Symmetry: C2
Subunit: 77 residues, 2 copies
């Protein structure tokens, strides 16, 4: 069943993205870009931080075991 | 400091690869191909299985927290 990810930006703004467990980190970034815009959140610039790691694009989201009740921090470089 | 990975093939053969913790799964596969040959272990065909996951190429090996005292299974498709 779909998983909910709660994201936090450097400006302390929060928002949620729903995805399937087999969809990758790359798909999460694409969803973020749709929600937050290409101007400030282009896919290629996004760095996602969770559990002391920088999340890798081709990993299925399930493999990071992300709890809906924590935050994934989204930074842009 | 370098990490040692112990691998097992489908033919029940074992072997070790030494790498740095920041080197990726892709680098592990390249090392496997050097040790085991392009004929049977081409990088593009290798699937690495550990902790109920298929290891993703661009992830630093450290992020999977692989114990030298367990096996990473290498299959080729």
């Amino acid at each position: 069943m779909a998983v909910t990810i709660t994201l936090k930006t450097l400006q302390q703004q929060t928002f949620k993205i729903r995805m399937e467990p087999d969809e990758t980190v790359k798909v999460l970034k694409e969803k973020i870009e749709a929600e937050k815009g290409r101007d400030a959140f282009p896919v290629a610039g996004q760095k996602l931080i969770y559990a002391g790691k920088i999340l890798s694009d081709d990993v299925p989201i399930r493999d990071y075991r992300i709890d809906e009740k924590n935050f994934v921090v989204v930074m842009v470089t």
